[PDB]
Amino acid sequence: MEFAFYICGLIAILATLRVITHTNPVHALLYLIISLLAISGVFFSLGAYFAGALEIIVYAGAIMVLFVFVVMMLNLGGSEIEQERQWLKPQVWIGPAILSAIMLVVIVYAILGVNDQGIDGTPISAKAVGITLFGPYVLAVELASMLLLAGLVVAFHVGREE
Amino acid sequence: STEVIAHHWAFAIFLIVAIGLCCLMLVGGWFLGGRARARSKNVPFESGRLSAKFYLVAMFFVIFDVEALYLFAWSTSIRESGWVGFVEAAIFIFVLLAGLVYLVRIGALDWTP
Amino acid sequence: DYTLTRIDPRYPLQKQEIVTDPLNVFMGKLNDMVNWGRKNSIWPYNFGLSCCYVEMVTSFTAVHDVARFGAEVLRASPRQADLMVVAGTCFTKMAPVIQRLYDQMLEPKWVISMGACANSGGMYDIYSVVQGVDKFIPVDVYIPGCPPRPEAYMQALMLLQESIGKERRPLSWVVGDQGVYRANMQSERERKRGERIAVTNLRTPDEI
Amino acid sequence: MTLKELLVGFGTQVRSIWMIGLHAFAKRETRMYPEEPVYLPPRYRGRIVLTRDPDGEERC
Amino acid sequence: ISPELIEILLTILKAVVILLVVVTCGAFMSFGERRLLGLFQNRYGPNRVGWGGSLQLVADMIKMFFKEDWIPKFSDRVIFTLAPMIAFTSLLLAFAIVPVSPGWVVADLNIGILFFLMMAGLAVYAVLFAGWSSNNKYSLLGAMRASAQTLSYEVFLGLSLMGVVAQAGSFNMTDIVNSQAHVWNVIPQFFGFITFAIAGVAVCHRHPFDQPEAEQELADGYHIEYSGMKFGLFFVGEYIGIVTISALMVTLFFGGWQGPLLPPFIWFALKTAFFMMMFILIRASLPRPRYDQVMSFGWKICLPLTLINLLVTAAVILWQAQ
Amino acid sequence: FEIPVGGGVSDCYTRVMLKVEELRQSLRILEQCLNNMPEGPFKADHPLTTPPPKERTLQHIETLITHFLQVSWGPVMPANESFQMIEATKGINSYYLTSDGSTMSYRTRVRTPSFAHLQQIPAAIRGSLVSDLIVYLGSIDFVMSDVDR
Ligand SMILES: CCCCCCCCCCCCCCCCCC(=O)OC[C@H](COP(=O)(O)OCCN)OC(=O)CCCCCCCCCCCCCCCCC
Ligand SMILES: CCCCCCCCCCCCCCCCCCCC
Ligand code: SF4
16 A cells, blocks of 8 residues: 555656656657556555556646647657757756755645644545535535536637638 | 465566566567568558547546546445435436536537538 | 679679688577577568559468568568568569668668569560669579469478578678678579470370 | 438348358358369470471471 | 476467467457458558568558657657557557466456556557647647547446446456347447447547547647657557457457357457457548547437436346345 | 449449449349340451461461461451440440551540549538548449540
8 A cells, every 4th residue: 555655656647747848749648648557556555545546547647648639749859849958058047946946845844834644545436426415515516517518618619720 | 465466466577477477479470570671651641620529528537437437436335325425426417417418408419510 | 603782872783703612610600590580580671663563462462471581570661671572563663762761771682673563664664674783783582473372482482491591691790891791592493404495294284 | 411321231231241251151162273183185285396207307 | 397387388379379379460450440441442552562561560660660760859759659559558458368268378367347448548648748748739739639539438338337247246347248049239238339339439549439540630639749669669559459459348248259150269350350340341431530529429429328228128127126 | 234323413322233234233233134145156267366266367378478477466356446434343335446557556546434533522522521432432332444445
C-alpha cells in the first residue's frame, strides 16, 4: 500500500515535471499519460477504486485522446515553438518558478499543521459511490449533465469548419 | 488474508511477465537479422489541411463518455437506489437523448457534404 | 558453387564474386532452421501491373490454393512483404516506380520475374518497354509464359524455396559475415534434359 | 435509415453468414499441385520441342 | 517450506500457465485464421509445413524474428517502438481478468470490466501513436479515420456492458458468472448481446472495421511503415484481442464455464472457440460498409439502443424486485 | 438473346446488374450455339486465307507455296481502308486498318471504351468521397492496357 503510493507519486511528479519542460507536444502528452496512470495508481493505493478506474477510463482515456487528436489536427512540427525555446531562458521562468515555490512553501506549511491519524486504505466500492451519487447528490448529477450539455453545444458552435 | 495477497502477487507477476515478454520479443526481433542499405529505403511510402469533423467526433465521444460514466456509476446500484434513482436516471437519459437528437438534426453527426 | 553479393550505394549497386562454401555445426543448424522458416513463409507483394498479375491472382485463389505453401498473406506495403513478383511489363514510365518499390523492401528479399515481358521484354520490342526487369534489379527466379500458367508460378515458388533452403545469410547484424551467399544451383534445363529427351509420343491434337 | 431497413439489413447479413457456412459444408475445389498432376489437353501450347521422323531422323 | 508460500507459488504458476496458453492460442489463432478461411473458401489453407500445417506458425515466427527490424530516420523512434507494445499489452491485460475455471483466475478484481474498458482506451492510444509516429500523411489520415471509428464504438461499448452490470448487480466477474447459473445472459440482454458484439468487433480492428484492409488502394494504412517483429506484434495483438473479446463474451453473456455435464473448462473452451469461428464467419461473409455509414450506425443507432436497453433492464429489475 | 437496359441512372449497382444480365444472355447464346452447331469447313476457301489448311499444305504443292509466302513475307492485302467495331466485354472496341498494298498495315488504329470511361471519370466522381472513387473504379470494368495499348 505504501510502496505503490510513494512510487506512483514520485513518478507522477517526475512525469509532470517532464511535461511542463518539454517542446514536443506528443512527447509531453505521453508523459502526462504516464502521470495520469500514476495518479490512478495513487488512487488505487488509497482505496478509491472508482476514482482511479475512472481516471484511466476518461481522464487518461477520453480527454487526452482529444488532445492527441488536436495535435494531429494542427500537425505541430515545431513551428514557433522550438525555434526560440524562450521558456527555457532563466530570465523567463525563474520568476514564476520562485512564485510557485513560495506558494508551495505556504501551502505545505498550512498542510503540515493539521491533524492526521493516517489513511487506513479500506476500499470504497463503486456501489457505494453509485448509492450516494443518486441519493443526496441528485441535483449535482442532473446539473452536471446540464454542464456537459453546455460544453457540448458551445464546442459545436465554435469548432466548425464552414 | 493469504488468498488475496496470492491473487495480488499473481496479478503483479502477470503484469511483469507480459511486459517482459513483449519487450523480449521486440528485442529478439531487433537483435537478429542482417541489415541492408539503399537510397529509397529511408524515403517514405508515397508510392513513388484536413477537416475538423474528427475533432467534433472525438469531443462528442468525450462528453457522451462522461455521461456514460455517470450511467456506469448508476448501474451498479440500481436495486438499492429504488424507483427514485430510476426516475432520476430517466431524466438523465431523456436529456442525453434530447441532446443526441439535437446533434443528429443539425448535421453535427452527419459527416457527408 | 556460391556467389557473394553485398550492396553499397548504372543499377544495380552490387557486385557478385565467386566464393566457395564456408559452411560449427550449431551455426549450420541455426542457418538451416532460419532458412526453413524463411522459405515456409514467403510474403509476396501485391503489385498489379499487367496480365501476368491476373494469372498470379488466378494462382492465389481456391482452385489452385497457393496458400498451402504459406504464401498467401499478400501485403500491400513493400515493407511488410518479402518477395517481389514482377508480373508484368516494365514500361519506361513505370520503371522508376518499380525501382522505388524494390528499394523500399528490406533484406531478406527475393525477386520473381513473371512472363516474357518481365523476363526479356518479350513480344513488345517497342520504344516504351524496357527489355527485361534484370536491366535494373537483380532477379532470383524467372518464369517464361505469356502468361505462365498458375501451376508454373507455384513451380517457380518451389524453385525459390529450395534456392532459399541452400543459401547462407547472416543470423545477426552484430556478429558474423554480413555478405549474402547464394548457391549456384544446377539449372533446370540440363537437370530435366535427362527425361525431356526420352519423350517419344504425345496425344494427337484431334481429341480433347 | 428506418427500422424496416435495419431489420432487412440484419436479415441479409444473417443470410450471407448462413450461405458462407453452407459453402463451408461443401467439397474442396482445389487441385493439389504438385501431388496431383495437372491434366493438360493435347493441343495445349507449352514447351517447344523438335520431333523426329518415323525412320529415326530429325524432321526439320 | 510453508503452505502459504506454496499457495502463492501455485497461484503464480497458474497465472503464468494461463498467460502462456493465451499467447500460444493467439498465434494458433493466426494459424486458425488461415486454416478456417481456407475451410470456408472451399480450399485447404496451409497444410504442408508439418502435419496439416501445424508447423507453419513456427515458420512465420522464425521469419519475423530474423527479418530486419527497421525504424525510419524521419520517424520518431520512441513512439514507433511503443505503439505495438500497447496494442499487444492492452488486450492481453483485458484478458487478464477473465475467470476461465473455478479456482483458475488471475485477478478477482472488484472492477474487472472497467479495467477491460481502460485497456480499450489504451488500444485507441496504440493506434493513434502508430499513426502519428510514422511521419506519413497517408498513415496520418488512415489512423485518424480508424481512431475516430473506434471512439465512435467505444462510446457505447460500456453502455452495452451496463445491462449485464445491472442484471449482475456488481462489477466482479465471479458474480457475473454466478448470476447466469440459472438462465444465460444472452437471452435477456439480447440488445446488449448485439451491441457488445458490434463494439467488440469494431474496437479490435476486425473486419468489417479493419482500417488497413478497408482502403488498400489509397495506400493510407497506418501499418504501411511497420515491418519486422513490430508487424507481427500488431497481428499477435489483434488475434489475442479476438481471444480476449471472445472470452469476455463467454464470461459475460453465455454463462462462462457453467455447463451441465462436461468439465467447466471444456465448456468455456467450446464456447470461446465457437465465438472465434463466429469471428471467422463474420470476417469472410460481411462486406465492409462506408465510413459515414459506420459513423451513423455507431452514433444514431447503437448508442440509443444501449440507453433504451439499460432503461428497460432497470425497469424490469426493479419491477421484479417487489 | 436480349439486350438489357437500365432505368436511366448509371449507378454502380445498375452497371453490375446489367453485366449480370449480360452474363445470363451470354449463357443463352452459348446454349443456342451448343444445341445447333453447323458442320463444315473451319477455314475459308479464299486464296488469301492465312494460313491455308494444314493437310493440304502438307501434301499439295501450290497450297504449300501459298503457305510459304503467307507465313514468311505475309499476305498482300490490296491498298484499301477498313473499319470494324464490335461489342467487347467492356464496351465498343474498334479496329481501323489502312493498307498501302504491302504485307504490313500502313495504319492500325485501335479504339477502346476504357479510354472514354477513364476520361468520363472526373465528370461523375466530382463532389464525392474517396471510397465512392474506389467503388467507381471497381465498377467501370476497365483495364489500363485497354486505355494505353
Ligand atoms: C464476441 C462478440 C462478437 C462475436 C461475432 C458475432 C457478431 C459479429 C458482429 C459484426 C458487426 C458488424 C457491424 C456492421 C454494421 C454496419 C452498419 C452500416 O453502416 O450499414 C450501412 C447500411 C446502409 O446504410 P444506409 O444509410 O441505408 O445507406 C444508404 C446509402 N445507399 O445499412 C445496413 O446495411 C443496415 C443494417 C446494418 C447492420 C445491422 C446489424 C448487423 C449485426 C451484425 C450481424 C450479426 C449476425 C449474427 C451473428 C452471430 C449471432 C450468434
Ligand atoms: C481460448 C481459451 C484460453 C484459455 C486460457 C486459460 C487456460 C487454462 C487451462 C486450465 C485447465 C484446468 C482447468 C481447471 C480444471 C477443470 C478441467 C479439467 C480438465 C481439463
Ligand atoms: S508476358 Fe504476356 S501475359 Fe505477361 S504481361 Fe506480357 S503480354 Fe501480358
